[PDB]
């Protein structure tokens, strides 16, 4: 019934793990700083109309535990009637928070909703929340658990992707991320992280290595191969994919996503909520979808999730102008490009997670806000956002510039 519109979409610069600028910043402070920016952009906005604050968090433990969305509402000074909920859908937690917020608006039971995610991987490492399936032997044995790292090498081995092929994609991601920063595409979106006094801490995605060469990536070692040969996940993955003889370890540190800090926020509301608050819509959520594939490969999820959201919205691949898949692994993107025959001029046009980093809980909202600002710069119509999810899941979202 009600139409969901994206009124704002901002994010923080992405730090790094080893000697990161954001290692001193609490993840709660990253969400508060973005709320402070939204007030700076709209000081005369009645925050009592904000019905909920939905955040995505994959490791809600310690600094990120205890409904950090609620901790962000109380610590930022927002009205106590704004609620707050933290959901975890692995890497797509940020995008699903946007989906859940948009679906809340269409239900008519919520007016204006903030959504996004936060993940300080330098303070809360990946997997600190334990694991219901990974640590339980009965569950790890029944459903064949093989980490996402091997699942990427298996796709490249199955689909025939060489070491030079994934290095050719990791190179253009470093370029299109450097081309995006030079052209200033992220100047309006990225909100620099400043301390209490206001002094600068980080103003740029510092995980990037824009001076990357083709010969430099080939000199790296696949750190994904020793864990597979020692842990024994190679033979486990090949027991289900029995028609594959040997796993070709093509993924290294230069062609996989980075372990970075960050947080993103997206303001979603109905047309009546934006008109009443003096807000103009920047994009419209056309359709969302949730599907999946086999959990052993763990990363073939974004392929049926995109086919579901396109057929549900009544569109095709030709009807979409921009495709944004999270660059968790290089072979994951090349797989999605081959499955749907995507022109690479429409696939991660402003770089992705290979160069700029992949904060687990917030990437879904970051690459969404990247597509909202890029649809306006290109003056295009539709954009499609997808992410590969651990557990063989997939979530896709189509937006349309207004």
């Amino acid at each position: 019934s009600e139409e969901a519109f994206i009124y704002e979409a901002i994010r923080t610069p992405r730090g790094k793990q080893k000697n990161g600028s954001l290692h001193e910043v609490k993840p709660l402070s990253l969400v508060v700083g973005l709320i402070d920016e939204l007030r700076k952009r709209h000081p005369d906005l009645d925050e009592n109309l904000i019905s909920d604050v939905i955040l995505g968090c994959v490791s809600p433990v310690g600094d990120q535990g205890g409904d950090i969305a609620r901790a962000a509402v109380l610590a930022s000074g927002m009205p106590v009637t704004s609620g707050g909920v933290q959901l975890n859908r692995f890497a797509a937690s940020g995008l699903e928070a946007v989906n859940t917020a948009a679906q809340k608006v269409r239900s008519g039971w919520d007016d204006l909703v903030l959504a996004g995610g936060v993940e300080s991987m330098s303070r809360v490492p990946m997997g600190s929340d334990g694991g219901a399936m990974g640590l339980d032997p009965a569950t790890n044995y029944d459903v064949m658990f093989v980490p996402q790292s091997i699942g990427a090498d298996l796709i490249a081995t199955i689909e025939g992707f060489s070491r030079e092929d994934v290095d050719a994609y990791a190179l253009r991601s470093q370029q299109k991320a450097a081309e995006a920063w030079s052209g200033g595409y992220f100047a309006k979106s990225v909100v620099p992280v400043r301390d209490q006094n206001g002094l600068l801490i980080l103003d740029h995605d510092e995980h990037m290595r824009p001076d990357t060469t083709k010969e430099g990536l080939a000199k790296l070692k696949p750190a994904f191969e020793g864990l597979a040969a020692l842990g024994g996940f190679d033979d486990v993955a090949l027991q289900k994919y029995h028609w594959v003889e040997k796993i070709n370890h093509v993924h290294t540190g230069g062609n996989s996503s980075g372990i970075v800090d960050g947080a993103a926020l997206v303001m979603i509301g109905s047309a009546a909520a934006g008109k009443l608050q003096g807000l103009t819509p920047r994009a419209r959520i056309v359709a969302t979808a949730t599907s999946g594939a086999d959990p052993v490969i763990m990363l073939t999820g974004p392929t049926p999730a995109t086919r579901k959201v396109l057929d549900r919205a009544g569109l095709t691949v030709d009807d979409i102008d921009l495709f944004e898949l999270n660059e968790a692994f290089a072979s994951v993107v090349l797989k999605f490009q081959k499955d749907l025959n995507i022109p690479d001029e429409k696939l991660n046009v402003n770089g992705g997670a290979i160069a700029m980093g992949h904060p687990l809980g917030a990437t879904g909202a970051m690459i969404l806000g990247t597509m909202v600002d890029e649809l306006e710069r290109r003056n295009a119509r539709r954009a499609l956002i997808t992410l590969c999810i651990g557990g063989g899941m997939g979530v896709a979202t189509i937006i349309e510039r207004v």
Binding site: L135, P137, A138, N140, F145, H242, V244, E245, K246
Partner: protein, 727 residues
């Protein structure tokens, strides 16, 4: 919920409380010679435990001993094999009572010591694990371990819960639980399963009572309190919540599938589950989780399969089942082995390892020395491991007399043959030696396919001629396929049957037929794989289907060890047995695939190239050109159909050997298929796989017929079930 099972069997425990207040429980089952965990033990332990709780004032310690040769071994297998899925309540309550007795003995507040005189296997060690102190006598032949996994069960009497508490999840699983490793009293003290060692068994009880008097005086607070019952207990390696173990904990099931190769064996994964899930909670809750997993296995089909083959079938063969029904005993004074190859050398080793004087002979004194050297590189690697001494190992190598002269067999009463399969060769080789040895000597022949009936026509005393088919490697392969010829005496069977038990190997009796039973059934296994490869099936799937079915070696890899040109000759000999009888030979579709590789010059690993590609004597992946030759991937049948094709083709061929008289019983069919052809142990044998079949069509022999008809309606007429089990 008491210490007894019912809220009139014999009593199996003695009681003796000395003037110091130290009770001595001496287990002594009257109905047998082995303290086994039966219904009479549960009632005896309950009466002894309830007495300890009532007399705890006048008691200061407890010593658990035994009056048998061994300490305590196993459980009542007669009952566990009959437990149906609806009997899971009684099975759960029974093991709950057994651990409730131990938990009371364990938390008695007084030192409880175990005096381990002999073997402590299965339920035997689990009683010693419930003791605060363990003393074992260093008597050769005493074993200590939890071999419940071999029968498809888990140690459900506190073995999992206590070994994990003593050593940790990682150590206890791989070293004690998952493989059911048996340890010597010297190796047991090394890992902590035993605390003290004594020379003789008479030193046990007086040292246990001396240890209690010392523990009470030097440690009055911690006396009778296990390490995990104290406040500051820290599990070795940590619990699943600690960061050190949780980082590597996801690798535990993946490493298990790596070892088991995806075989449907539910026991090793249940042990790992009860081990980790027990470390997350307290002992009494961990003891209950261990029981729920144990009852899940007992009521399962796989456990009844392994308990049928690895217990009832093995104890029946060693009892003299297929032995001649009524024959005496005749010893062996000197063994003669012909041929110093990889077979003849290992035979001279396992014979000399049993203390038999061996006269090894090849064509040359050179190769005869290299034949004995095969056993030298087996005793040296055993002397490095410290399992034998320099005195005994030099007496073993002193019994073998390698030579090239035929007159050195003067005085041999048991002949072993181990050369190539040539009838004119075996006729002349036996002819050179038949008049030399003792007239009573057995004329054995290690033969693969050649019928013993024809080979016996080359000697004068055909009643003393028999087939003794070993398996490579001889030092480890424990099956001996004894082929019975038409002229073979009944006494000849017993003399070789008693010899096989003397060398610690398991024998089976086979009547002379085509391919005997092992080489005949293993042929249908490799044929089904080569049939699939010719049909366009991916080679990588055939290797996975072989390993996931339960075979130790994938079929294409085995098709390279077994020379591909050697199998072509077996099809030539079979094509001769039918067309010289008049009938039209119906060739298996795998024969055309064999000749396709023969024409390409890839006839197995021996040539250096077969289905795999070999380099520096090491198997190095599959041949890349194998896909273009047979158009791999053109046919993609389900993996479960591939597994059923390689399993049914061997189960159906085993059933034919039972009808044709090739095999006398099903115990030789089950054990012979496992310890010989390499049949998956979770099936309990090739004959047990029929009546114990479990699939998406049912359970038992009736479901086997429907699945065989389903495989026959899609993969050829060769899968139709015989009349011996039809409808």
């Amino acid at each position: 919920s008491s210490h007894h099972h019912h809220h009139m069997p014999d009593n199996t425990i003695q009681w003796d409380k000395d003037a110091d207040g130290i009770v001595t429980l001496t287990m002594d089952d009257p109905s047998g010679s082995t303290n086994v965990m039966n219904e009479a033990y549960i009632e005896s332990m309950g009466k002894a435990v309830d007495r300890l709780v009532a007399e705890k004032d006048s008691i200061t310690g407890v010593v658990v001993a035994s009056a048998k040769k061994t300490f305590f071994a196993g459980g009542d297998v007669k009952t566990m094999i009959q437990a149906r899925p609806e009997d899971a309540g009684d099975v759960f309550n029974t093991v709950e009572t057994i651990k409730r007795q131990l938990r009371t003995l364990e938390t008695l507040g007084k030192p409880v010591v175990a005096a381990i005189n002999g073997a402590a296997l299965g339920g035997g060690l689990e009683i010693a694990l419930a003791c605060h102190h363990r003393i074992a006598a260093d008597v050769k032949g005493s074993q200590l371990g939890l071999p419940a996994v071999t029968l498809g069960l888990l140690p459900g009497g506190g073995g999992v819960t206590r070994t994990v508490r003593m050593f940790g999840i990682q150590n206890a699983f791989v070293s004690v639980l998952a493989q059911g490793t048996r340890f010597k009293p010297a190796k047991a003290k090394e890992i902590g399963l035993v605390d003290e060692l004594v020379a003789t068994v008479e030193e046990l009880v007086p040292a246990a009572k001396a240890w209690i008097k010392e523990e009470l005086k030097a440690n009055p607070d911690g006396a009778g309190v296990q390490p995990w019952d104290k406040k500051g207990y820290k599990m070795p390696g940590g619990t699943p919540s600690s960061p050190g173990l949780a980082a590597i904990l996801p690798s535990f099931p993946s490493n298990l599938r790596k070892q088991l190769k995806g075989a449907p064996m539910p026991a090793p994964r249940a042990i790992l589950a009860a081990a980790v899930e027990g470390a997350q909670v307290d002992f009494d809750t961990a003891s209950r989780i261990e029981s729920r997993y144990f009852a899940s296995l007992v009521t399962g089909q796989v456990a009844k399969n392994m308990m049928q083959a690895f217990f009832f079938d093995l104890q029946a063969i060693n009892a003299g089942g297929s032995r001649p029904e009524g024959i005496g005993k005749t010893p062996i004074k000197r063994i003669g082995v012909l041929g110093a190859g990889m077979m003849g050398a290992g035979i001279a080793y396992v014979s000399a390892k049993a203390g038999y004087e061996v006269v090894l002979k090849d064509v040359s004194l050179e190769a005869a020395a290299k034949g004995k050297g095969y056993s030298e590189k087996l005793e040296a690697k055993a002397l490095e491991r410290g399992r034998t001494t320099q005195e005994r190992s030099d007496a073993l190598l002193a019994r073998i007399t390698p030579t090239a002269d035929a007159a050195d067999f003067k005085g041999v009463d048991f002949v072993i043959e181990a050369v190539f399969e040539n009838q004119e060769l075996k006729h002349k080789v036996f002819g050179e030696i038949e008049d030399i040895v003792e007239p009573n000597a057995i004329l054995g022949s290690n033969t693969s396919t050649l019928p013993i009936t024809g080979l016996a026509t080359g000697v004068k005393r055909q009643e003393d001629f028999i087939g003794i088919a070993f398996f490579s490697p001889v030092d480890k392969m424990p099956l001996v396929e004894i082929i019975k010829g038409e002229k073979t005496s009944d006494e000849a069977l017993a003399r070789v049957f008693d010899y096989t038990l003397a060398i610690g190997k398991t024998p089976i009796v086979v009547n002379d037929s085509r391919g005997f039973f092992t080489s005949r059934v293993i042929g249908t296994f490799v044929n089904e794989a080569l049939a699939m490869l010719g049909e366009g099936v991916e080679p990588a799937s055939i290797e996975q289907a072989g390993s996931q079915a339960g075979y130790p070696a994938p079929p294409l890899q085995l098709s390279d060890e077994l020379n591909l040109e050697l199998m072509h000759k077996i099809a030539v000999a079979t094509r001769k047995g039918v067309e010289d009888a008049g009938g039209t030979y119906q060739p298996h579709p795998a024969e055309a695939v064999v000749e396709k590789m023969i024409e390409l010059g890839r006839s197995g690993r021996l040539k250096g190239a077969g289905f795999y590609e070999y380099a520096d004597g090491k198997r190095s992946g599959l041949w890349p050109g194998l896909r273009e030759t047979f158009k791999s991937g053109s046919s993609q049948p389900p993996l479960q159909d591939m597994i059923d094709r390689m399993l049914f083709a061997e189960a159906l061929e085993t059933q034919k050997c039972l009808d044709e008289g090739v095999l006398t019983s099903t115990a030789d069919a089950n054990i012979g298929s496992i310890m010989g052809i390499g049949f998956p142990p979770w099936t309990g044998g090739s004959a047990q796989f029929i009546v114990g079949y479990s699939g998406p069509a049912g359970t038992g022999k009736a479901a086997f017929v429907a699945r065989a008809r389903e495989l026959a309606a899609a993969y050829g007429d060769r899968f139709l079930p015989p009349e011996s089990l039809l409808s």
